[PDB]
Every structure is written in C-alpha cells, then in structure tokens.
Amino acid sequence: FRKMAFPSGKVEGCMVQVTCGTTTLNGLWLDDVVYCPRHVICTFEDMLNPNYEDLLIRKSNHNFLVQAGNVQLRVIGHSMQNCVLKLKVDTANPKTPKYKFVRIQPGQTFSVLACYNGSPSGVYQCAMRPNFTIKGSFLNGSCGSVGFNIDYDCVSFCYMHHMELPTGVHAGTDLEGNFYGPFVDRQTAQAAGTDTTITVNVLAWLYAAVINGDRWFLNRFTTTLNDFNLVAMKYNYEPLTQDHVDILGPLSAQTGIAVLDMCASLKELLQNGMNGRTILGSALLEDEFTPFDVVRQCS
Amino acid sequence: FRKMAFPSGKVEGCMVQVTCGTTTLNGLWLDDVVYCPRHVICTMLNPNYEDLLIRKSNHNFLVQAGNVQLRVIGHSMQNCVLKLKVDTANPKTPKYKFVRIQPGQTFSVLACYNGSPSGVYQCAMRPNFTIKGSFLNGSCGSVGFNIDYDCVSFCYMHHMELPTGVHAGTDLEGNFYGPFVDRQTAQAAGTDTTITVNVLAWLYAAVINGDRWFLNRFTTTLNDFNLVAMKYNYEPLTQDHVDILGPLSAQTGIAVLDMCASLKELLQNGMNGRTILGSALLEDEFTPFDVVRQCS
Ligand SMILES: COc1cccc2[nH]c(C(=O)N[C@@H](CC(C)C)C(=O)N[C@@H](C[C@@H]3CCNC3=O)C(=O)COP(=O)(O)O)cc12
Numbered sequence: 001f002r003k004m005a006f007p008s009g010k011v012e013g014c015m016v017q018v019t020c021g022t023t024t025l026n027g028l029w030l031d032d033v034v035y036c037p038r039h040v041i042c043t044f045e046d047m048l049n050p051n052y053e054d055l056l057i058r059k060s061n062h063n064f065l066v067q068a069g070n071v072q073l074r075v076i077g078h079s080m081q082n083c084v085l086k087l088k089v090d091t092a093n094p095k096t097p098k099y100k101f102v103r104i105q106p107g108q109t110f111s112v113l114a115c116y117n118g119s120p121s122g123v124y125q126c127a128m129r130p131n132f133t134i135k136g137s138f139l140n141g142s143c144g145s146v147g148f149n150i151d152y153d154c155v156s157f158c159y160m161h162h163m164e165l166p167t168g169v170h171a172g173t174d175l176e177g178n179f180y181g182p183f184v185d186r187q188t189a190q191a192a193g194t195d196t197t198i199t200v201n202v203l204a205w206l207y208a209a210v211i212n213g214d215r216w217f218l219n220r221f222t223t224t225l226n227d228f229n230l231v232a233m234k235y236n237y238e239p240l241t242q243d244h245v246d247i248l249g250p251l252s253a254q255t256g257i258a259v260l261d262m263c264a265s266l267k268e269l270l271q272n273g274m275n276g277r278t279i280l281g282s283a284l285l286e287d288e289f290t291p292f293d294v295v296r297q298c299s
Numbered sequence: 300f301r302k303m304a305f306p307s308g309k310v311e312g313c314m315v316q317v318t319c320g321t322t323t324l325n326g327l328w329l330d331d332v333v334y335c336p337r338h339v340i341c342t343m344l345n346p347n348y349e350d351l352l353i354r355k356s357n358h359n360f361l362v363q364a365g366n367v368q369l370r371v372i373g374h375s376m377q378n379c380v381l382k383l384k385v386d387t388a389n390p391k392t393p394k395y396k397f398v399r400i401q402p403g404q405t406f407s408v409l410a411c412y413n414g415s416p417s418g419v420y421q422c423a424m425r426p427n428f429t430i431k432g433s434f435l436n437g438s439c440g441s442v443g444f445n446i447d448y449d450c451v452s453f454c455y456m457h458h459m460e461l462p463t464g465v466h467a468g469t470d471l472e473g474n475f476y477g478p479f480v481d482r483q484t485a486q487a488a489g490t491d492t493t494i495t496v497n498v499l500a501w502l503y504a505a506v507i508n509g510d511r512w513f514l515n516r517f518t519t520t521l522n523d524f525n526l527v528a529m530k531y532n533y534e535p536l537t538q539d540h541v542d543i544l545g546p547l548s549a550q551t552g553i554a555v556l557d558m559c560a561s562l563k564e565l566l567q568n569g570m571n572g573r574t575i576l577g578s579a580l581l582e583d584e585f586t587p588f589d590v591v592r593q594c595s
C-alpha cells in the first residue's frame with residue numbers, strides 16, 4: 001500500500017506555456033481555451049495591490065504568447081473568471097480528454113502534475129487540508145500546474161496552483177478561479193488557519209494496514225461516536241460524522257472490524273503514541289488516504 | 300520532500316495486453332516489438348520454458364492495444380521476457396533505452412491491469428533487490444522507468460510478490476534483479492540493509508535547507524566508513540556512489556568523506572531526540588538526483 005497518483009498522460013497533453021511581458025507560467029489547454037492564473041498579466045508595480053479588471057482591460061490579444069511545445073497558438077480572445085484567465089485560441093486541442101471542473105472538499109485527495117514552462121515534471125498525490133492548503137512540491141515557475149482525479153476516462157480538474165506560503169505549504173484555486181481558503185493572489189506573506197488532521201482518512205489508512213496484514217494497533221475495546229469525537233477534538237482531529245462512518249462501511253465489511261472498534265484503536269494510538277512502532281512503514285499517523293483511495297488500490 | 304513519480308504519459312502510450320490461453324498480462328509495445336513476462340505461456344511449479352515455447356506458435360498469442368488486436372509475426376524468449384514481433388510499429392514509441400539499475404536507484408512504476416494504467420508511484424530498489432510496491436493479480440508486466448530529457452529509460456518489469464509482501468522482477472532484457480526465479484514458489488530475499496548513498500543525499504538535502512547541526516570537524520577514509528557502516532546494517536559505499544554525490548557535495552561545499560564522518564557519528568551516537576528535516580528517522584529512498592530534482 002503506497003501513495004499512488006493517477007496516470008497523468010491525459011493531463012500532459014493539455015499543458016502549455018503562457019507568457020505576458022516578463023512573466024511565464026503554465027496553462028491548461030482544453031478544446032479551444034487556455035486556462036492559467038490571472039497574475040501572468042502582471043508586472044512589479046501592481047503586485048501588492050493589482051486591480052485585475054483594470055489591468056486586463058489594458059491588454060490586447062497579441063500581448064499573450066501561448067506555446068504548445070514549439071508550436072505557438074494564436075490568442076483570439078481573452079476573459080477573466082475570478083483568479084483564472086481564459087484565453088481563447090484558434091486551434092482546438094485534439095488531445096482534450098473528457099473532463100469536468102470540480103471544487104473538492106477538505107480531506108479529499110487529488111493528483112498534482114507539476115509543470116515548468118509548459119513541460120510536465122512530476123506527479124504525486126495531495127490532499128486538500130482542512131485549512132485549505134496542500135502540502136505539495138512546487139518551485140518557481142510551477143504556477144498553473146493542475147491537480148485532478150480520474151474516473152472512467154473523465155478527468156475532473158480541481159486545483160490550479162498559485163502560491164507557496166511562508167510555512168512552505170501551498171495554495172491555489174479551483175478551475176473557476178476561486179481560491180481554496182482565505183488566500184489572495186497578491187505578492188504578500190500569507191498565513192493559513194490552524195490545520196487539523198483528517199480523521200476519516202486516518203481510519204481508512206488503519207483499515208488499509210489491516211488489509212495488508214498489520215494488526216498490532218488493534219485492541220479489545222470500543223467507543224461511542226461522541227466519546228471518540230471528544231478525544232479527537234482534543235488532539236486537533238476533525239470530527240467524525242455518521243456519513244464518514246457510512247463511507248467506512250465497505251472497509252469494515254472487508255476486515256470485520258466495526259468502525260467504532262477502529263475508533264477505539266485510534267484513540268489508544270493518540271493517547272499512548274506509537275512507541276516507536278510503525279504502521280505501513282510510517283512512524284506518523286497518515287491522513288492523506290481517503291476511504292475511496294484505499295478501496296481503489298487494495299482492490 | 301515528496302515521493303514524486305515521473306509523468307507517465309510516454310509509458311501509458313506503450314502499454315498493451317498479452318494473452319495466452321486464459322492468462323492475460325501487461326506488455327510493453329515499442330516500435331514493432333511487444334515485451335512481456337514469459338510466464339504468460341504457462342498453465343508453473345517449475346516450468347520448462349524452452350519446452351513450453353516450442354509448443355507455441357505466433358497465432359497462440361493475443362496482443363491487444365485496448366480492444367484492437369495487433370497481429371503477432373514472430374516470437375522469441377530472452378531470459379524471463381518474451382519478445383513478440385507485431386506487424387505495426389507503435390506510433391507513440393518515445394525515445395527510449397533499456398537500463399539495468401543498481402540498488403538504491405529510484406524509478407517510477409506504472410501499475411497496469413489488462414493493459415490499462417491504474418496508478419503511478421516511485422519505488423527504490425532495495426539492497427536485497429526487492430521493491431516495496433503496490434501490485435495485485437494482473438499486474439505482471441507493469442514497468443518501471445526513469446525519464447531524462449524526454450528519453451524513457453525502462454529498468455523494471457514486474458513478475459512476483461514475495462511471501463513478505465515486497466516485489467521482485469526483471470530488467471527489460473529479462474534478467475531478474477536478485478536471486479529470484481519465475482516459478483510459483485515461496486522465495487525469500489536476503490536480509491535488507493540501509494541505502495547509505497541515499498541517506499547521505501538526504502543529509503545534503505538537510506544542509507541545503509539550513510538543517511546542519513549534525514556536521515562535525517572530522518573526516519574518514521571510505522574503507523573505514525564502510526567497515527563501520529556494515530556493523531550498523533548500512534550498505535558500503537562504492538566509487539560510483541561517491542561520484543553521484545559530487546553535485547550535492549559541490550553545491551554545499553561539504554566533502555563526501557566529510558559527510559560520511561558526520562553520518563558515522565549519527566550511527567554510533569544516535570539522534571538524541573533531535574530531528575533532521577523534521578524527523579528522527581533517516582530517509583533512504585531519495586537518490587542524489589531526487590534531491591537536486593526537488594531542491595532545484
Ligand atoms: C512578499 O511576498 C511573499 C512573501 C512570503 C511568501 C510569499 N509567497 C508568495 C507567492 O507564492 N506568490 C505567488 C504569486 C502571487 C501573485 C500569487 C507565486 O510566486 N507563485 C509561484 C509559485 C510559487 C513560487 C515558489 N513556489 C511556488 O509554489 C508562481 O509560479 C508564479 O510566480 P512566477 O511566475 O514564478 O513569478 C509571495 C510571497
């Protein structure tokens with residue numbers, strides 16, 4: 001059981017380079033529109049307080065250079081949707097997959113395709129933290145990289161990358177250009193709210209560990225939903241809902257460990273620590289696997 | 300630092316399925332050859348692969364890209380891989396090479412089932428020539444690779460899950476990594492060791508990021524370090540390992556043998572609760588290339 005990303009080939013065919021003035025970043029080319037962060041239209045004098053509609057009215061179509069590989073695509077239009085710039089081009093992307101734009105919930109996971117100068121560099125799995133950051137791996141020039149999920153040939157795009165907080169975590173928007181979290185596309189040091197641990201995911205991951213032959217953390221005891229939630233809130237864990245209990249159903253069905261039985265195991269791990277033992281190789285409780293992630297991989 | 304795979308699209312375009320009788324596995328379609336594990340021809344406790352392949356003709360092999368059949372016009376065996384010549388050159392063939400990697404080297408795995416990609420993740424080849432994968436029935440023939448300047452270097456084809464749950468396989472010339480054989484038998488790997496060259500890379504990563512309390516005023520010979528490292532279940536360093544630490548050594552200004560003396564102190568003295576890049580455990584699945592990848 002490993003942190004597994006989706007195959008990224010359908011996304012790689014959509015990545016292009018967008019340049020305006022001195023600024024270069026990555027864009028997503030679907031059919032005849034290129035999506036990229038709007039701060040590509042920006043110079044130094046506005047980065048503390050850019051009036052984006054005012055900056056965009058002053059740009060022409062020819063101010064935008066879009067490159068797909070060596071080929072240049074001609075911009076025939078432009079518009080802005082929140083923090084995302086939409087550049088209409090005169091060529092459809094023939095590699096456009098079946099796709100949707102989705103806004104994910106905190107605790108859900110997605111694959112990031114890290115790109116630089118329109119060229120894909122790496123792929124890895126991330127979770128939308130409860131404080132709406134993601135713990136990613138992004139360097140200078142990674143803006144416009146996208147995160148996505150795949151099911152039955154449909155790519156659901158959920159994240160476009162915009163910024164790295166002083167603490168090294170990352171922030172961005174959905175593909176309608178709305179930030180996850182309280183962040184803003186201005187050149188300032190921004191702080192996130194206090195993060196918490198994704199409780200339903202830690203439980204899913206404990207179930208994955210039992211599916212893969214590890215049981216040392218289980219115990220004889222059980223707890224009520226509310227008593228577990230009291231202890232979990234004490235340790236800055238998100239609350240566990242009956243919907244989460246339902247969603248864990250299949251995994252408890254497979255292993256024959258009732259959800260509130262596994263909650264008792266987690267409560268002991270939280271109150272006692274792991275004592276140097278490891279679960280699935282980790283010395284830390286892992287919260288970036290969803291129930292679906294576990295099921296889809298283990299079977 | 301993340302475990303980060305290479306983008307998989309150039310390899311996705313080369314995955315097909317190969318069926319013999321009712322056994323289906325993954326194959327790799329490059330130009331007009333499809334490579335796959337030879338045990339696709341098996342019905343297994345100790346196959347006579349030479350004798351089994353004599354009873355097989357071109358028309359016993361069903362090669363499909365999706366649901367499109369590619370006609371087999373030739374077949375041969377090279378070690379534990381089957382090579383099927385097909386009548387169509389793969390138009391998505393990337394620039395490619397077959398390479399045999401060394402313990403410690405990392406690569407991306409594209410886990411496939413029935414010729415269809417399922418996921419991608421990074422693996423490290425352990426000193427006992429196993430990898431810590433995520434593979435189910437139907438995954439044999441999935442490949443591992445590195446991508447460098449759009450050239451895909453294929454280094455791994457998947458064959459086997461050991462009783463302990465780790466995995467074993469061949470290079471693309473069909474030679475197993477490790478002492479394993481492609482039989483339906485419980486095989487045990489040798490006792491594993493810590494990948495020293497990669498721990499050193501990780502210490503360099505820490506230094507690059509300002510975390511350098513562990514550096515000291517001593518140095519060591521390679522031989523002295525290796526004899527001590529073996530006593531702590533660490534792999535000995537080779538000349539090639541010292542060479543691939545060069546770029547990180549130059550960037551930090553810390554000599555490789557100086558960094559070996561620093562690690563030697565960590566092994567004999569432990570961590571003392573202090574952390575290195577956030578943890579009390581030393582990480583051994585990032586190569587020097589992985590480190591400069593994620594730092595620059
Ligand atoms: C005083 O200000 C600060 C103080 C303290 C921390 C700070 N952090 C940021 C920030 O992150 N700012 C965004 C731009 C604003 C307009 C949203 C940015 O820099 N995004 C990067 C990706 C980033 C770059 C490194 N790792 C990434 O993930 C692009 O890729 C586009 O930038 P470039 O095209 O390369 O100029 C500003 C800032």
Ligand SMILES: COc1cccc2[nH]c(C(=O)N[C@@H](CC(C)C)C(=O)N[C@@H](C[C@@H]3CCNC3=O)C(=O)COP(=O)(O)O)cc12
Nearest residue numbers: 338434435436437438439458459460462481482483484485
């Ligand atoms: C009694 O013997 C044993 C005892 C204890 C442990 C054992 N382990 C194996 C083994 O590994 N056997 C190979 C076949 C031989 C000929 C090499 C195999 O099963 N490979 C899988 C991938 C595997 C499947 C699950 N996870 C994987 O990694 C394929 O994919 C091809 O087989 P399939 O037709 O697709 O099922 C035999 C064995």
